[PDB]
Design a protein around this motif. Structure first.
Motif, mmCIF file in Angstrom:
data_model
loop_
_atom_site.group_PDB
_atom_site.id
_atom_site.type_symbol
_atom_site.label_atom_id
_atom_site.label_comp_id
_atom_site.label_asym_id
_atom_site.label_seq_id
_atom_site.Cartn_x
_atom_site.Cartn_y
_atom_site.Cartn_z
ATOM 1 N N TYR A 161 -11.797 -4.971 -0.425
ATOM 2 C CA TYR A 161 -12.750 -4.124 0.282
ATOM 3 C C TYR A 161 -12.816 -2.777 -0.432
ATOM 4 O O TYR A 161 -11.797 -2.096 -0.583
ATOM 5 C CB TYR A 161 -12.353 -3.949 1.751
ATOM 6 C CG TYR A 161 -13.395 -3.185 2.540
ATOM 7 C CD1 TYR A 161 -13.317 -1.809 2.682
ATOM 8 C CD2 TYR A 161 -14.481 -3.840 3.107
ATOM 9 C CE1 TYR A 161 -14.284 -1.109 3.378
ATOM 10 C CE2 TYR A 161 -15.445 -3.148 3.808
ATOM 11 C CZ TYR A 161 -15.344 -1.784 3.937
ATOM 12 O OH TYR A 161 -16.308 -1.090 4.631
ATOM 13 N N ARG A 162 -14.004 -2.398 -0.891
ATOM 14 C CA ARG A 162 -14.187 -1.228 -1.748
ATOM 15 C C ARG A 162 -13.315 -1.283 -3.000
ATOM 16 O O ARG A 162 -13.015 -0.246 -3.604
ATOM 17 C CB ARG A 162 -13.966 0.086 -0.992
ATOM 18 C CG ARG A 162 -15.085 0.444 -0.018
ATOM 19 C CD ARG A 162 -16.410 0.734 -0.731
ATOM 20 N NE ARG A 162 -16.763 2.154 -0.685
ATOM 21 C CZ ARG A 162 -16.766 2.981 -1.731
ATOM 22 N NH1 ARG A 162 -16.449 2.555 -2.950
ATOM 23 N NH2 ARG A 162 -17.105 4.250 -1.554
ATOM 24 N N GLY A 163 -12.897 -2.478 -3.403
ATOM 25 C CA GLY A 163 -12.189 -2.663 -4.650
ATOM 26 C C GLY A 163 -10.675 -2.631 -4.590
ATOM 27 O O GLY A 163 -10.040 -2.565 -5.650
ATOM 28 N N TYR A 164 -10.069 -2.708 -3.399
ATOM 29 C CA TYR A 164 -8.617 -2.631 -3.246
ATOM 30 C C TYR A 164 -8.053 -4.001 -2.904
ATOM 31 O O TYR A 164 -8.276 -4.520 -1.805
ATOM 32 C CB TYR A 164 -8.233 -1.603 -2.185
ATOM 33 C CG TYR A 164 -8.578 -0.220 -2.627
ATOM 34 C CD1 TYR A 164 -9.841 0.305 -2.400
ATOM 35 C CD2 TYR A 164 -7.659 0.542 -3.311
ATOM 36 C CE1 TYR A 164 -10.166 1.564 -2.820
ATOM 37 C CE2 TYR A 164 -7.966 1.788 -3.735
ATOM 38 C CZ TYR A 164 -9.223 2.302 -3.508
ATOM 39 O OH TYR A 164 -9.498 3.578 -3.933
ATOM 40 N N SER A 165 -7.309 -4.570 -3.847
ATOM 41 C CA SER A 165 -6.653 -5.844 -3.613
ATOM 42 C C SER A 165 -5.718 -5.738 -2.420
ATOM 43 O O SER A 165 -5.090 -4.692 -2.189
ATOM 44 C CB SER A 165 -5.863 -6.261 -4.853
ATOM 45 O OG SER A 165 -4.792 -5.368 -5.115
ATOM 46 N N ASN A 196 -12.916 9.505 -1.160
ATOM 47 C CA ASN A 196 -11.659 9.573 -1.897
ATOM 48 C C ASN A 196 -10.902 8.255 -1.895
ATOM 49 O O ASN A 196 -9.781 8.203 -2.408
ATOM 50 C CB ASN A 196 -10.778 10.704 -1.355
ATOM 51 C CG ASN A 196 -11.141 12.056 -1.944
ATOM 52 O OD1 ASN A 196 -11.845 12.138 -2.953
ATOM 53 N ND2 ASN A 196 -10.649 13.122 -1.327
ATOM 54 N N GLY A 197 -11.488 7.197 -1.346
ATOM 55 C CA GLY A 197 -10.857 5.896 -1.398
ATOM 56 C C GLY A 197 -9.525 5.887 -0.671
ATOM 57 O O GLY A 197 -9.290 6.645 0.277
ATOM 58 N N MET A 198 -8.481 5.009 -1.342
ATOM 59 C CA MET A 198 -7.205 4.948 -0.642
ATOM 60 C C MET A 198 -6.334 6.177 -0.848
ATOM 61 O O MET A 198 -5.256 6.252 -0.249
ATOM 62 C CB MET A 198 -6.436 3.674 -1.006
ATOM 63 C CG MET A 198 -7.069 2.423 -0.428
ATOM 64 S SD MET A 198 -6.000 0.986 -0.505
ATOM 65 C CE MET A 198 -4.800 1.401 0.762
HETATM 66 CL CL CL Z 1 -12.115 3.837 -5.110
#
Ligand code: CL
Ligand code: NA
Length: 129
Positions: free
Chosen positions: A20-24, A103-105
């Protein structure tokens, strides 16, 4: 509810957090160890006076209302208490919104300080895939 490592992963996978949004998935399971030691009930105070709630430790200033945090925005339309349940859904709907906040994770200081730049696959190694 205190989760097992692979028990949490399957619950997080069933809610689609994987990439999700690129986070494995590993990034999320890793965030959930170090934010809360895998415990849906953990609550913690921050200095700024806000409190962090639940599995991922969602913060009351923006994200849920706890009635004691000045200026709360309750950007998940939710009571912070509901994020302590044993049904991680509200914590995921909200976590989907935080991560998507630009800012993502890095929104999770234990992810930045402890997960990021690591082989986040050890966190699901042994999970039945
Ligand atoms: Cl990101
Ligand atoms: Na809030």
């Amino acid at each position: 509810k205190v989760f097992g490592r692979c028990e949490l992963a399957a619950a997080m996978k069933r809610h689609g957090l994987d990439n999700y949004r690129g986070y494995s998935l590993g990034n999320w399971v890793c965030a959930a160890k170090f934010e809360s030691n895998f415990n849906t009930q953990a609550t913690n105070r921050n200095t700024d006076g806000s409190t962090d709630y639940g599995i991922l430790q969602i913060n009351s200033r923006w994200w849920c209302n706890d009635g004691r945090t000045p200026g709360s925005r309750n950007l998940c339309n939710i009571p912070c208490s509901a994020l302590l349940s044993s049904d991680i859904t509200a914590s995921v709907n909200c976590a989907k919104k935080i991560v998507s906040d630009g800012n993502g994770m890095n929104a999770w200081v234990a992810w930045r300080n402890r997960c990021k730049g690591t082989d986040v696959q050890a966190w699901i190694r042994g999970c039945r895939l």
